[PDB]
Assembly symmetry: C4
Homo-oligomer: 138 residues x 4
């Protein structure tokens, strides 16, 4: 398992949407989705939202009016699984640094004093033992 297990998926979301888009607009926007690699590129351009809509979608949408769904969806997914990936890093680097350290040091400072209390506790039975013997010898 893991976090970069998304870098797997994203590039498959990609693979998917590329092939999907290529099958459609290969026909009539072979400028962009002429080929797979072409769609690949385009879709990374779209990933980046560098004229994503006016450049690509809207033209494509004029020809294929529903395409809006394709482009709008790809985006929400593309971006979403990046946000989902990017944060998995905020986390796996956030708590890589002072959060492994602390958990260990308090796992340590805590068993430090189940140590202290418990035995120090003991001398008190050892005392309720020495003294125990003496209300007897009273």
């Amino acid at each position: 398992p893991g976090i970069a297990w998304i870098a797997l998926l994203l590039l498959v979301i990609f693979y998917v949407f590329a092939v999907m888009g290529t099958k459609l607009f290969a026909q009539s926007f072979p400028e962009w989705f002429g080929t797979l690699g072409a769609s690949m590129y385009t879709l990374f351009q779209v990933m980046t939202l560098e004229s994503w809509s006016m450049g690509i979608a809207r033209p494509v949408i004029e020809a294929y009016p529903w395409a809006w769904i394709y482009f709008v969806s790809f985006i929400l997914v593309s971006s979403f699984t990046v946000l989902n990936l990017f944060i998995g890093i905020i986390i796996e680097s956030m708590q890589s640094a002072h959060w492994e350290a602390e958990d260990a040091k308090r796992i340590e400072q805590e068993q430090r004093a189940h140590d202290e209390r418990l035995e120090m506790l003991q001398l008190i039975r050892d005392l309720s033992s020495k003294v125990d013997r003496l209300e007897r010898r009273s």
Copy 2:
């Protein structure tokens, strides 16, 4: 109950703004604001800031002066309510992967000792009597 509230609110924000956008720039910028389902797009584009001003606002404003406020305001709120939403995952993904798991494991370990330092404590008051029995009894 939860953060889909911002989502909802931010989805409200769309509905709400796409609504006005439709009615106003409808007749002037009809590809952009003719039908709701096309101010929706256009706003989702505006949302993404993909040729947001030069493509849509400037022209909507080169005609309608106040529209600026419309677009600007939409953006600030749009982005802002996500920023708020985005972070609400950084946090809830942080207060889920890390901030929550010890929140339990430390009151889990604190009670382990108020039951032990207070357990200690009985013995110490109980040595108190067995001996307060001896300033007098022995």
Copy 3:
């Protein structure tokens, strides 16, 4: 003050920069910098990186070769004090629903660490204080 202090700072930064566009690209790029409320607008557009130099400072810089310094810096500063501000929100949001009231409940956990402890010791001394009345006899 805090987050809202950068807020101010930035909006300072903005006015201070739309200040210049208007004093500066006014005669000539009046679509963008002709007057203030239009630099303001432009500046916000430029902030958000919608056609910022292709649309804007490439043709402004077809005007002035130095102007590049103008739009570039504005961004690196503009973007910069937001990153600074944004972060101040992950921070003052990330330690506000997860990390804030812990320091108060662990103020309080470490609080009885004295209450029990100190009162226990109190007993200890009193034990001794009487035991010592028994070096006195025995």
Copy 4:
């Protein structure tokens, strides 16, 4: 050392890619790559993804079509090290507000007891010793 370590890195790439990019495109795309000083510009114009494929890579690519690779890669890395760099600031600011400051408050309410109980303890022996000293007394 610190993290400007990455500022170096990115800035090495920002330099490296413009030098690499003048070599190729200087010839035939002068307005963007016929120099370094405007390559740089362009490359930060590219850094930002303002008309990146559409404005630039595409027509450039049109000429040296494998130019995609240079744009795409640039971008993946340019961005990616700002991600590693931005994160740094998230962490070196989340590890600065409470991470560094609070860790110290705990060094203190940790070492407060190994001192408090040392002597709670201490008094426990003395007590034991007097009774232990009362074995060879009576």
